[PDB]
Structure formats: structure tokens, C-alpha cells
Ligand SMILES: O=C(CCCCCCC(=O)Nc1ccccc1)NO
Ligand SMILES: [K+]
């Protein structure tokens with residue numbers, strides 16, 4: 312069974328931010344226009360018995376002082392009066408400024424993604440769903456006491472923490488254009504949560520990590536060799552990104568044998584994203600790199616959490632996430648999900664113009680990374696006393 316996080320209030324909150332606007336409504340209404348909703352189990356966002364219970368849940372990762380500053384930021388932004396000099400200093404000390412500004416629903420908006428991803432982790436734990444999708448989540452940059460790249464609360468870390476605390480090993484796969492720094496850092500010292508981020512990295516490109524350090528860092532203490540990274544040069548197409556990631560994913564699965572897989576599916580790798588870095592598509596016959604990776608992960612038959620993330624071309628993010636959703640139903644249930652290449656009529660139909668089609672409107676260094684990663688995987692397996700066939704893994708690359 313495939314679950315999807317949705318709710319009336321959830322949709323209102325996920326649509327309340329200045330950066331992501333109505334993106335979540337476009338994604339959910341396109342999935343609905345394509346008649347996918349009757350094939351999915353609605354997973355309600357988690358709600359708490361009291362403010363103390365909510366604080367206990369969020370503070371499993373975030374500091375109380377940061378959560379307090381985030382809630383104060385919402386309160387201050389619900390008042391006409393400008394912030395005092397003292398409050399400006401307090402907010403800057405948590406990086407609650409710049410690409411992480413305040414807005415009237417900043418706390419409710421941030422908390423909603425945590426509510427959705429924690430409920431999605433619970434549905435996997437109780438075996439109600441084999442896979443759960445949360446297009447309102449995937450806020451990979453948020454740190455313990457710091458907002459970063461429009462991520463205020465780290466719903467991923469919190470969902471993984473719920474999964475690990477459920478012998479349990481979690482594999483985290485981050486497909487976003489940006490390095491999954493917040494998640495990687497949270498589990499830097501933990502061998503039980505293996506993190507893998509594929510992303511662009513170049514001088515001055517956000518956040519600056521997931522690449523050669525001035526050496527390639529990969530975790531510390533008992534978590535040494537547990538944080539995997541594949542930085543890629545700009546312009547990579549569906550096929551080359553699929554071949555660069557494919558052997559890594561299969562190798563991680565074979566060696567780690569994860570109990571759960573958590574996938575961040577940021578849509579900013581799309582050729583049509585305004586970042587204009589990678590040339591990935593949502594094409595499903597070249598085959599979308601996203602659809603290739605998700606199909607591979609799903610073939611493992613491991614309980615999986617699929618989350619959103621980046622994606623600044625709202626109708627193109629909806630086009631991709633609708634295809635990921637339909638593919639998830641197909642792979643899990645074995646039921647063919649035929650999707651018309653024409654966008655069906657609905658509320659947001661006008662946003663898919665002027666052509667109104669489902670396909671997005673688009674027409675060696677890796678070998679050295681593969682050898683380095685294989686060696687890191689062997690090192691991780693030896694440190695963690697894991698049994699694996701080296702020849703079976705080496706042959707994958
Ligand atoms: O996508 C991110 C965050 C990256 C840094 C935050 C800036 C996001 C942004 O505003 N991107 C953009 C939007 C419109 C046009 C061009 C770039 N993390 O995964
Ligand atoms: K990534």
C-alpha cells in the first residue's frame with residue numbers, strides 16, 4: 312500500500328510561505344487531476360496532545376532556544392510593529408534572516424512539514440504503508456539551532472530519528488540539486504543512518520559542502536565512512552546522472568541492508584528549474600534520472616519514505632512529482648498507472664500553458680568518485696563488521 316500526506320489544514324500551511332507559494336497545491340491538484348488519489352491512502356499529519364508534547368518532539372533534534380526563537384519570529388510577524396534592535400540580533404544568531412526570513416505563518420509552515428514526515432514515518436513503522444510520500448516535506452538544510460536555505464525545521468532528521476528508534480539501519484538518499492548538509496551533519500557520528508547525497512558542487516554554490524574539503528570527509532567516530540557524497544559538474548543529463556548514481560545505490564543497498572529508505576526528491580535538477588544547473592527531465596518512455604533512481608530504490612522492497620524539497624518551477628515540479636507518485640503506485644501495487652501526456656482539466660490547468668503537456672518543455676571524474684565510494688563502502692562495512700560479497704559490489708561499478 313502507498314500512503315500520501317495530505318489534509319485541508321496541511322495544504323493551507325504548506326501554501327503559506329513566500330518562497331514556495333502555492334507549489335504544494337499544484338502538486339496535489341495535478342495528482343488528483345490524474346485520478347491517482349483513489350489509489351493512495353491519505354496519511355494525516357501528526358498532531359500533539361499539548362504544547363509540551365510538540366516541544367518534546369521537535370527538540371528531539373532542535374534546541375529549545377531555536378524553537379523558541381522560531382515561534383517568537385512568527386508572533387513578531389503577526390504584529391504591525393517592526394522588530395526591535397534586540398529581536399533583530401536574536402533572529403540573526405539563529406540565521407532567521409536572508410533566505411530564511413520571518414513571515415506570519417513561519418512556525419506553523421515549518422512545523423507542518425515535521426507533522427507530515429513524522430506521521431509518514433509512523434505509517435511505515437506500523438506496516439500500514441509500504442511507501443509513504445510527503446510532497447510538503449524534505450527540508451534537508453535545517454540544523455539543530457540554525458535555519459538554512461529556506462529550511463526552518465528538519466522534518467527529515469526527525470522522521471529518520473523516529474525510524475531508527477522504532478539493529479535498525481536507515482539509508483538516506485538525497486536527490487536534490489543541493490548537498491543534503493543538515494541531514495548529513497545530524498547523523499555524522501551515527502553508523503545506523505547512512506547518508507548519500509548526489510548534488511552539484513562548485514565554488515560559491517550553496518551550501519558549499521559534499522565535496523573535497525580544504526580531503527573528502529565522510530563521518531566521524533563510530534560514524535566514520537557513513538556519510539556518502541557524489542558532487543557533479545553542471546549540465547549533467549538523465550542518462551549520465553542515472554549511470555553515475557545507479558551502481559552507488561545498488562552497492563549501498565547490498566552492503567547496508569537498510570530497514571528503511573528515506574528519499575529526498577528535490578525537483579531543482581530539472582533542466583527547466585531557474586537554477587539551470589542539471590538537465591534532468593520527468594520523461595518516462597531518455598528516462599528521467601529521478602524516475603530511474605526511485606524505480607531502483609523501490610525494487611529493493613524496503614519500507615520507503617519519499618519526500619519533496621527544492622523545486623522553483625512550480626508546474627514542472629508538479630509534473631515530475633505526479634510521475635514519481637504514479638510510478639510508486641505501479642512499483643508497489645503492480646497495477647499499471649497510465650497517465651495521459653496531456654494535462655487534464657482542473658483548478659490550476661492554466662499554469663501548464665501554452666502547451667498543457669505532462670512532459671517538461673525541454674530538448675572519468677565519475678569513475679574516480681566511483682572508486683573512492685567503493686573504497687569508503689568497504690571501509691564502512693569493515694568498521695561495522697558487516698558481511699558482503701566484495702566481487703558482487705565491485706562488479707556493479
Ligand atoms: O533548494 C535549496 C535551497 C537553495 C538555496 C536557497 C535559495 C533558493 C532560491 O530562491 N532559488 C531560486 C529561486 C528562483 C530563481 C532562481 C533561484 N535546497 O535544496
Ligand atoms: K542532493
Ligand SMILES: [K+]
Nearest residue numbers: 498501504537
Ligand atoms: K551517518
Ligand SMILES: [Zn+2]
Nearest residue numbers: 487489579621
Ligand atoms: Zn535544492
